[PDB]
Amino acid sequence: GVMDVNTALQEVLKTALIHDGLARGIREAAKALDKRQAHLCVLASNCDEPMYVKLVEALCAEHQINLIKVDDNKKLGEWVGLCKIDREGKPRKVVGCSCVVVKDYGKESQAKDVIEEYFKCKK
Amino acid sequence: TPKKNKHKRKKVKLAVLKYYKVDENGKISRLRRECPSDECGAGVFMASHFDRHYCGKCCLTYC
Ligand SMILES: [Zn+2]
């Protein structure tokens, strides 16, 4: 238990880029959630329609599905790793997906260390 | 015809809302028919048209 909530989660946003965990967007998260391989989730509160957040919640409740809440998808552009970077490594197109699901587990010892502790406290 | 136009994609914004009718408990009334396919079953809906029911991925069709 060394890393934080928004510190150990960049490892969750690391191997999904490597071994195909990213169910990012609006249609890739839920439509592949029902195929008994999806594991994690992060809800983002940014909405002009609260039904969007209300979509995610019952989707988290039909197969006892895990959930984290980090604030907004304008903030999550600085989290996920899907940005157009410039000549010096500075992102100019800062767009990240709100609801980021990670299906597969590349087996680690610092993301499952920190964040499974927060998972058992929540549920 | 001097100017042949092409196919603009229909700009329908935020339509996954219509796919899932979330009830007031935690249920979802799944208003669209699920495709029974082997390739694309259990995750991919079909299309409720005015008389028929049509999957788009493996091109499966019902009335
Ligand atoms: Zn089909």
A85: how many CB neighbours lie within 10 A of its CB?
Answer: 11
Report the candidate in B26, B60, B28, B29 with the shortest Cα–Cα distance to residue B46.
B60
Residue-wise burial string across A88-119, b where 16 or more C-beta atoms lie within 10 A, e elsewhere: eeeeeeeebbbbbbbbeeeeeeebeebbeeee
Shortest Cα–Cα distance, B6 to chain A (Å)? 26
Q: How far is the CA of B57 from the centre of ligand 1 (A)?
A: 6
CA distance, residue B49 to nearest chain A CA (Å):
20
Interior angle at CA A22, CA A121 and CA A60, nearest 5: 40
Return the amino acid letter for A10: Q
B24: left (phi over 0), alpha (psi -120 to 50) or beta: alpha
User: With contacts defined as CB-CB under 8 Å, which chain B residues touch A52?
Assistant: 14, 17
Among the partner residues B17, B28, B43, nearest to A58 by beta-carbon distance: B28
Indicate the resolution in Å: 3.1
- The coordinates were experimentally obtained by cryo-EM
Residue boundaries of the structural domains of chain A? 1-123
Rounded to the nearest angstrom, the distance between the alpha carbon of A35 and the centre of ligand 1 is 16
Convert B29-44 into a string of H (helix), E (strand) and C (coil).
ECCCCECCCCCCCCCC
> Residue type for A38, please?
A
